[PDB]
């Protein structure tokens, strides 16, 4: 199935995934296209930041849902 990622500057990308895809898998697919390492990526869907070890199915993410890609401004 296809899902979408709204990336950093205005663009959207399209991913081919299965419901069983892990969040790590999804981040790897984003890296394949965008060259942003998985350890930098944060993916937001329905207010949840998606966590490594879990699958798309765990979050009930269905076809044509959009994940929101954000990085970090670390601060103390």
């Amino acid at each position: 199935m296809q899902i979408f990622v709204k990336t950093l500057t205005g663009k959207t990308i399209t991913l081919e995934v299965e419901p069983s895809d892990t969040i790590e898998n999804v981040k790897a697919k984003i890296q394949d296209k965008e060259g942003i390492p998985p350890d930098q990526q944060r993916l937001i869907f329905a207010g949840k930041q998606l966590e490594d070890g879990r699958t798309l199915s765990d979050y009930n993410i269905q076809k044509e849902s959009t994940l929101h890609l954000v990085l970090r401004l670390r601060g103390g």
């Binding site: 500057t9 329905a46 849902s65 670390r74 601060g75």
Partner: protein
């Protein structure tokens, strides 16, 4: 004066304090804590995260029973949030929006009015008009996620995906608790918040390597994807994407984004023939630094009295409204106008 307590820095914890102050000045969330209404909503049984809600509420209660110049320690609260979200163990610098998402998730889960989530199976709703499909998808979401936290922060996006060959528009409805906005790069005379909202809600061309599969055409096709807001939240949190897309080394985007104090009118972003909302600003989380490090503060308007203050850990100082809009703004907290 009420609600002007500072929060102790526990070791790089201003990202946390900034968010906590923004939440402290989220009128209805504050009131939920002060009136102890969370007690009725807490789940029965020995739960690992009951104390997360209790310590959050206790902290807000303490802030709103303080005298000016008071400094409150959020150490007990930190213990609870790091138990819920172990990434906040220790004393490293962190992202405020990341913290916000984990904190609100924890609070929401622990006061969820739904105590046993129904599984739910996917349904074919092609027979329904767009708006009715939206309403049904919303009902399905609420039967799983229904809390006071949601009452305030949750809205619904519509994503419309049109195949340029057959003309079929496939619609999906995604809940949201905040919106993360790309920063405009071609703005004149300045970059505005509306410019950033437009980048979020614009027609996105999906072609080449981004071609979706059209189920009607039975093949990959150029499609146009567009967001609109189907349901507006009571509290709108806007998160500015202040990071470059460099494939080598991310840099912070420090562009001034001009955001309004009053009358943020989102008419143009509402779904077709759907009632829109207008908002006033009440809080800002500011970041000063780089992507790898820096310092957080908050600017917050006290509910009802309308006075702005800068919250910088232990230091709480009055400020003019002319000082609120800065390039350091990272998270904007808006509430419905009048």
């Amino acid at each position: 004066a009420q609600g002007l307590a500072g929060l102790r820095n526990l070791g790089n914890t201003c990202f946390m304090n900034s968010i906590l102050q923004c939440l402290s000045n989220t009128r209805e969330l504050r009131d939920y804590c002060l009136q102890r209404l969370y007690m009725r909503d807490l789940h029965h049984g020995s739960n690992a995260h009951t104390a997360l809600v209790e310590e959050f509420a206790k902290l807000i209660q303490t802030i709103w029973t303080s005298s000016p110049n008071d400094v409150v320690s959020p150490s007990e609260f930190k213990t609870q949030i790091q138990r819920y979200a172990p990434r906040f163990v220790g004393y490293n610098q962190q992202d405020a929006q990341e913290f916000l998402r984990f904190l609100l998730d924890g609070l929401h889960n622990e006061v969820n009015r739904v105590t046993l989530r129904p599984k739910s199976n996917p349904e074919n709703l092609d027979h329904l008009p767009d708006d009715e499909k939206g309403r049904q998808m919303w009902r399905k979401y609420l039967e799983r996620e229904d809390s006071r936290i949601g009452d305030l922060f949750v809205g619904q996006l519509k994503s419309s995906l049109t195949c340029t060959d057959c003309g079929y528009c496939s619609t999906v409805f995604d809940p949201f608790w905040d919106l993360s906005l790309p920063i405009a790069k071609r703005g004149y005379p300045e970059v505005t918040l509306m410019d950033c909202m437009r980048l979020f809600t614009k027609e996105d061309v999906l072609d080449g390597d981004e071609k979706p599969t059209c189920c009607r055409c039975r093949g990959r096709k150029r499609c146009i994807k567009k967001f609109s807001i189907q349901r507006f939240p009571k509290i709108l949190v806007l998160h500015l994407k202040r990071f470059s897309e460099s494939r080598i080394r991310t840099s912070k985007l420090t562009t001034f984004v001009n955001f309004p104090l009053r009358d943020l009118d989102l008419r143009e972003f509402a779904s077709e023939n759907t009632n829109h909302a207008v908002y006033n600003l009440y809080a800002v989380s500011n970041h000063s630094g780089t992507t790898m490090g820096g310092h957080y503060t908050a600017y917050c308007r006290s509910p009802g009295t309308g006075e702005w203050h800068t919250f910088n850990d232990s230091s709480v100082t009055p400020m003019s409204s002319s000082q609120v809009r800065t390039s350091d703004a990272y998270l904007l907290f808006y509430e419905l106008a009048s």
